[PDB]
Amino acid sequence: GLKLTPGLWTSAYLRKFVPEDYHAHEIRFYEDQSRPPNAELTACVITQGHILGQLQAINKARQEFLLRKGRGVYLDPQSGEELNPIP
Amino acid sequence: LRFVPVDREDNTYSYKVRYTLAVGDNRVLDMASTFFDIRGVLDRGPSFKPYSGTAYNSLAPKGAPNTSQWIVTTNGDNAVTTTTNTFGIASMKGDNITKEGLQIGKDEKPIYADKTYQPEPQVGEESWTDTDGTNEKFGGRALKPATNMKPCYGSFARPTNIKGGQAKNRKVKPTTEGGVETEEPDIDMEFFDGRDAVAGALAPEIVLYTENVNLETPDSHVVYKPETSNNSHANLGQQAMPNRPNYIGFRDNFVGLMYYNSTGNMGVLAGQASQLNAVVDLQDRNTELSYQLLLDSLGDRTRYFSMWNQAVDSYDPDVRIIENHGIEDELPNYC
Amino acid sequence: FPLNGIGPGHTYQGIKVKTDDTNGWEKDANVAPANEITIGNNLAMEINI
Amino acid sequence: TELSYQLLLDSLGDRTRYFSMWNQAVDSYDPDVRIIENHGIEDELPNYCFPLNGIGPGHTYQGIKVKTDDTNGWEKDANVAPANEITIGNNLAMEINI
Amino acid sequence: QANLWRSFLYSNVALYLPDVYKYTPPNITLPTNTNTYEYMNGRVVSPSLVDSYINIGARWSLDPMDNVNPFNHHRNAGLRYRSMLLGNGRYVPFHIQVPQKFFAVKNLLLLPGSYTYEWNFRKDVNMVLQSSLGNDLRTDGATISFTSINLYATFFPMAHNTASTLEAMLRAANMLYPIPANATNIPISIPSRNWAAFRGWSFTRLKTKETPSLGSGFDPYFVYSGSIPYLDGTFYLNHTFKKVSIMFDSSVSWSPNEFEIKRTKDWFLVQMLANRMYSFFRNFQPMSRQVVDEVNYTDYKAVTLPYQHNNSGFVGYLAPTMRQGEPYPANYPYPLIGTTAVKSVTQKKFLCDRTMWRIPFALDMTFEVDPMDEPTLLYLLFEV
Amino acid sequence: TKDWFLVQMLANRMYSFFRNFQPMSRQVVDEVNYTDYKAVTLPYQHNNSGFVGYLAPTMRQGEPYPANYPYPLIGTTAVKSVTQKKFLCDRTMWRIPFALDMT
Amino acid sequence: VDSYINIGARWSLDPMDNVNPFNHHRNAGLRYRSMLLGNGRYVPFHIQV
């Protein structure tokens, strides 16, 4: 398989909890304070950002190709120009 | 990478193609980026009419018949099967008519009309204020009683000679030596004088060339056919209506050209030594409709392409829902 | 144009070249006694649409 | 100079892309005249012209009534005018493809 | 003006009516096949069925027309665009490029292995081509033929380290139901599957003559080449639904048992809550018309179509034939306006097309449908 | 030729390429394969005969008769066909990128 | 140029290709200017160039 199923990501998201940045003494409501977070924000399952960048790149190329040739294109039989080119 | 297939079999209803892929070492294969490249020949059938209304004799009244002839059996004890009536026009002016035919040009040795093309149907006297008087010899050309009667509307007869004539080549020319047969244009000469003419002085008054043509109606049909017998008098009034338009082409997003969800004919993306079909092409999911909805969803990004949807099926909104507000016909319109 | 493509006309008969060399014409029997054959162009009325 | 001016004005379109009537004088042609798309005419039906009275000419007829006797014979009538116009069959017409 | 209006109505509505309203001219013989071009052409439809007076003064689609595929028309812009794109002749060579779809919705990627990839294509003309009329192109004489197909693929770099990281790191159903002719009830039973993933289902009505028996190599009984709503989403028989009832088994709510389609604001709300081109509120269209009252107008007499005469003497009678008849006052229609108006009642109907129904969320249902004169199918899209 | 298309695009409004370029394609009767072809000159082509002025905007003249032009490219008696291609570019100019002699 | 000219296709007439399309009476700009001057043979003009 090796397919990132909804079920696995949700389990990773649920299990995770940062012990720090959880102020149990008073009401703080981070994102109302003008201070940085105690720990850097990281994804649940994926850790290295390089791989995430690559996956984003392949997804973007996928989408752009699908837009470029989704309909399929008619091109002249004798010559080789596109009869319905979209810019 | 281009990829010429390894094996191809062109069965009766399918065109199977098989490939072989290469290991993705330090690389991985974006499959959805793949796209085919087809080149072939298409025949759209005899029911391809990319236009409304006829293309031949569009101006002709829809009941007007060509200048044709028919034969009446007149059954009886003494049958007379040589009636051979005619109905038509004679518009080619001439000075006189003789055995040769209509006279067109005098040089005397007058030149008589060539039977292959003349009298050209196009050419007719252009005068309503003519009042020429004297003897108005006239000529024309009509259709023989072998060609099927059809209305002028949408009537075609392929040209047989460079000069515009339409006569067929008679395949019969018997000779008294055995030998071989010969081809002659199938054209004749019929003469008419007048109903009240007295037997004493009968002279030609209307020449009329008669021939057979490959009459056909490529873009029309018959809506009123009085009598069953071909080439009858009542049949002169048969009506014609143009063939219905019928545009043929490919489908929206080349639907149907692949074999998605075909259990009998599926594909496999398995390894050379795996025997595990990675393409579970079953009928549970309707791939083409999934594609259609996916493309529709992708409109968000592609809201700029105004011709993004120049192929999707649509209808004229006014045809489906009709708004009848009458016609501004206050005045008359005279002829 | 009229419905038949032609206006009215006149009834004509059929005549054939005499089997003799004589330059005279005789009534024919292989053609009907009456034939409708208009002479000249056809009646019409024009309108500016 | 004049062609330089023309190209210069064309180049200045960038700023003046808002004026929709910016180019209401430049020469142009009807696109359909230059390139013709012939798809026929929807002439399925005919289009007749009828005389002004709805009828062509006709013939003058008289009136006749069943005889008071059982005899299957007809006599001239006096309660109907001597001459009556009554056409026979359909009416004269001429068709045009509008 | 009258002639132009009548010609438009004829050429754009009358010729496309169902075949029950046409007739075969005397003295002419037409093929016995009802899906061939010769037959669809020879039949002649009386020009008086849709005349200049049809529903004068209101927006109202013709009653016969509602159950006719609007997309099988010669004013179909897309079909005409495609047919022009191929050319203007009967024989044309084609150069085309087509995208692979199975992996467009599955989105597969391949690591090493030296795989084999084989795919089949269609030569059945009906499914590959299209026609405005929809006449069986197979028997008409249309053919297709290929010369060379080549595959274009695009690989991309990715470090073996990334692939190893991934490898060590991660260590909808379609159902078609019958509907006999002139049916009104339809009790169905869903096969028992995993109750989960029931994230709502859709449904619409199709025709047996239009849905192809997908799941073989070639369906000999597919004798139509028009619009296949089962494959291009051009559904049009959505207004023929009356009521859908689920059995008492409990269901998660986005959870009623019966929904009224048309007797209702409730369905409008449900469809809106379920919510482009294939979407509600872009294809929904209500209409309202005033018509002669049947039971209150005392001097009412419903004349059958053969005995209604309007424009008598100045049109072909029950045939596109030359002038015939005599002038005389007409009897149809009844004047709804004027100094001699008749009593009136109000009618209401709606058309929704290129769309689908979406119910929010062994299961048993019962469907209600307005009766139809040909077999139909109940399409169900259980999203999972 | 695709080469010229590329050159003109690389050289790159109202007076610009890609706004005035228009290709066209038509099917026409084949000349050398259709065995029963005969090219009738314009003066001897008759269509709508009898219901139009002959070679002149003149009143009705002639007699009804089947036409000879054009040849049916469609139908049950279609003729063989060939493909023609042409383009129109206007309100524009050619631009070659960069004693000199040319031809 | 009859009703059947190149039936069913987009094709500019062969004679017409070598004729200035801008010398036409459907020229929108020229008609705009001619209207701007008026609808008579004699007209006075006030202009800025």
UniProtKB/Swiss-Prot annotation, chain A:
It is found in: Host cytoplasm. Induction: Expressed in the late phase of the viral replicative cycle. The modification Phosphotyrosine is found at residue 74. Might be cleaved by the viral protease. Phosphorylated. Tyrosine phosphorylation enhances preferential binding to tripartite leader mRNAs and allows ribosome shunting. All late proteins expressed from the major late promoter are produced by alternative splicing and alternative polyadenylation of the same gene giving rise to non-overlapping ORFs. A leader sequence is present in the N-terminus of all these mRNAs and is recognized by the viral shutoff protein to provide expression although conventional translation via ribosome scanning from the cap has been shut off in the host cell. Belongs to the adenoviridae shutoff protein family. Monomer. Interacts with hexon protein; this interaction allows chaperoning and trimerization of hexon proteins. Interacts (via N-terminus) with host initiation factor EIF4G (via C-terminus). Interacts (via RRM domain) with viral mRNAs that contain the tripartite leader; this interaction allows ribosome shunting and expression of viral late mRNAs. Protein that inhibits host translation while promoting late viral translation by ribosome shunting. Blocks host cap-dependent translation by binding to eIF4G, displacing MKNK1 from cap initiation complexes and preventing EIF4E phosphorylation. Binds to the tripartite leader sequence of viral late mRNAs and recruits host eIF4G, PABPC1/poly-A binding protein and 40S ribosomes subunits on viral mRNAs, allowing ribosome shunting and efficient translation of late viral mRNAs even though conventional translation via ribosome scanning from the cap has been shut off in the host cell. This is Shutoff protein. It comes from Human adenovirus C serotype 2. The gene is L4. The chain holds residues 609 to 695 of 805 of the full protein.
